[PDB]
Design a protein around this ligand. Structure first.
Ligand SMILES: COc1cc2c(c(OC)c1OC)-c1ccc(OC)c(=O)cc1[C@@H](NC(C)=O)CC2
Length: 127
């Protein structure tokens, strides 16, 4: 039924950086994933209330989604690119854990992960 508070996206106590790698993650990596036909389930936190999933947040204790990642990039939440890459991986891994191979949702996540891994590959050298 109830949703947990979303992952943190604002914290003036957390140190942050604006870097070319983080700029790339927003302007190239998130932009490309966001517009994908399979993005929609990943654009906001899993809504246990709306989707009637009483068990989701019992199984998934570190939830993540592109809506949260988007806020984090736009509001300069991160110290480094690795932090952001970890959020994407957490999001994919959550999906694989909660669901089973060959589920539509898993196929959709797998397709997004493929685009992601490719963009991550051309990540600029840090300045
Ligand atoms: C009643 O409708 C929906 C209900 C759910 C989901 C969903 O998006 C595909 C829905 O469509 C709006 C769903 C959503 C997101 C997930 O993670 C991003 C997930 O792991 C898992 C899911 C769903 N599990 C699947 C698709 O096997 C269960 C909850």
């Amino acid at each position: 039924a109830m949703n947990p508070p979303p992952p943190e996206t604002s914290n003036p106590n957390k140190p942050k950086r604006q870097t070319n790698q983080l700029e790339y993650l927003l302007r190239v990596v998130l932009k490309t994933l966001w517009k994908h036909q399979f993005a929609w389930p990943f654009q906001q936190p899993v809504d246990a209330v709306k989707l009637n999933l009483p068990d989701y947040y019992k199984i998934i204790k570190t939830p993540m989604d592109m809506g949260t990642i988007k806020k984090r990039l736009e509001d300069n939440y991160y110290w480094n690119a690795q932090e952001c890459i970890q959020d994407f991986n957490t999001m994919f891994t959550n999906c694989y854990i909660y669901n089973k191979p060959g589920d539509d949702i898993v196929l959709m996540a797998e397709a997004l992960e493929s685009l992601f891994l490719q963009k991550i590959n051309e990540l600029p050298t840090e300045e």
